[PDB]
């Protein structure tokens, strides 16, 4: 399996620069007087015309031969001093190269995180491998449990494994040099996240989820979820239930062994755990549990999917849920949408999920405001059926 490592990197301290005080008014008067003298002298050389005067009038005022050095006293008397520029430009360049070294370190870290996440969370299309890496996740609360109950739902941002230590000793905002300050702002802004990684939902932290948006968006995501669980988790660890009013949309699930009821047998094999109503629960085995405590492992973790739109769920489903079972409310209703942290809302036609920001590690909500979460890995019925025809080939 791949490797990933956290790091901590302190950002460098921006440059400081003293703001120019501005020249006093008499200096301007003196400058104008000096120019007046210079033009008066040369003018009287032109008016006098003799080559002796034309020599003398240039020979005596040659002072720049020393004044090029005496510029150093500009910083003593307070004249204009543009000449510190080269040193500052060198400092800028140096700082920028240091920042580049940090950026490439962030790049390699983000590449490692990407390789790891996509190894754990392949895209739905790629799940047709169906062997070798299939069903390899494990019940037991160590190791694989970090990804046992978690499902890739989309792609989006995440915080890197590098941690940006504070740029200590920040100069005050009048001393702060514009370039290095702005560059560091942009670094902190954009190296804050890795873009287009797999976005994950943990099944172990919410009693249910409710899917609000357009019907085919919601369905496509649901098929993707189902096939992700079916590839990643074996039928002995995760069992599946679909409760529907439109079984034609769900006819593909018959091939998937996770929908097989081990208790009832028919001609085709195990009974399909697809019901046309919540009243059609003739199981009563997933409905003798207690309320659910979010994990911080049941024998199968039942996943019950509903798009029946029936008021009768609120009887067998309290405000807290059932122990070994997580739910997915298709066709979002006020019964299931009573917890915004559970609502995955397709805000944009492409399938942009918004929900609450959750911690990468604990999956716990970090703040209550709804925000961009993912673009959903929506999958077609044909691809789902094709994967199901692959998964039906296996019985281990």
């Amino acid at each position: 399996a791949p490797v990933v490592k956290p790091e901590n990197i302190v950002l460098p301290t921006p440059l400081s620069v003293p703001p120019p005080e501005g020249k006093p008014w008499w200096l301007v008067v003196v400058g104008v007087l000096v120019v007046g003298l210079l033009v008066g002298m040369v003018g009287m050389t032109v008016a006098s015309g003799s080559r002796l005067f034309l020599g003398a009038g240039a020979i005596f005022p040659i002072f720049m031969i020393g004044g090029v050095a005496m510029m150093m006293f500009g910083g003593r008397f307070g004249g204009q001093q543009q000449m510190s520029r080269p040193k500052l430009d060198a400092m800028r360049a140096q700082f920028m190269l240091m920042l580049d070294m940090l950026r490439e370190t962030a790049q390699e870290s983000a590449d490692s995180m990407d390789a790891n996440y996509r190894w754990f969370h392949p895209a739905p299309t790629t799940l047709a491998a169906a062997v070798g890496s299939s069903r390899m996740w494990e019940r037991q609360p160590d190791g694989k449990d970090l990804n046992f109950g978690v499902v890739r739902v989309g792609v989006g941002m995440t915080r890197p494994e590098v941690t940006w230590g504070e740029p200590q000793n920040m100069p005050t905002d009048i001393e702060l040099e514009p370039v290095t300050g702005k560059a560091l702002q942009e670094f902190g802004r954009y190296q804050s996240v890795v873009y287009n990684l797999p976005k994950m939902v943990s099944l172990l932290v919410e009693p249910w989820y409710s899917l609000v948006g357009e019907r085919e968006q919601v369905l496509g995501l649901t098929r993707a979820i189902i096939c992700q669980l079916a590839f990643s988790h074996g039928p002995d660890h995760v069992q599946m239930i679909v409760v529907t009013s439109d079984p034609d949309r769900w006819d593909w699930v018959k091939w998937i062994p996770h929908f097989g009821d081990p208790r009832r047998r028919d001609a085709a094999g195990n009974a399909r755990m697809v019901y046309t109503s919540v009243r059609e629960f003739a199981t009563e085995q997933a409905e003798l549990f207690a309320g659910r405590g979010s994990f911080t492992t049941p024998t199968p973790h039942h996943v019950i999917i509903s798009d029946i739109e029936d008021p009768q769920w609120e009887y067998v489903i309290s405000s807290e849920g059932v122990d070994g079972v997580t739910f997915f409310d298709l066709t979002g209703s006020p019964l299931w949408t009573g917890a915004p942290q559970r609502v995955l809302r397709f805000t944009d036609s492409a399938g942009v999920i918004e929900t609450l920001p959750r911690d990468r590690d604990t999956w716990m909500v970090i703040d209550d405001n709804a925000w961009f979460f993912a673009l959903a890995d929506q999958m077609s019925e044909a691809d789902a059926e094709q994967f199901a025809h692959q998964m039906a080939h296996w019985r281990l």
Partner: protein, 72 residues
């Protein structure tokens, strides 16, 4: 043209519509955790393609650079 040979990289920056950052001259706020969200490119066939994601508006730098080269 002898001057223009020296000014040709600068003009090719300027015509390509690359613009260097504004400077926070007096706003005195330097921390902004706005984390710009992905622009997302829908595949032109549409049907059954999960749409792709690029990191920000800054993806237009990749276009502007190739334009700057062509100007130069």
């Amino acid at each position: 043209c002898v001057l223009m040979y020296h000014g040709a990289p600068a003009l090719s920056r300027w015509l390509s519509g690359i613009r260097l950052p504004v400077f926070p001259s007096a706003t005195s706020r330097w921390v902004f955790e706005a984390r710009p969200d992905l622009p997302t490119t829908v595949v032109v066939s549409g049907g059954g393609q999960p749409t792709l994601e690029g990191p920000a508006s800054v993806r237009d730098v990749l276009l502007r650079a190739e334009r700057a080269r062509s100007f130069l």
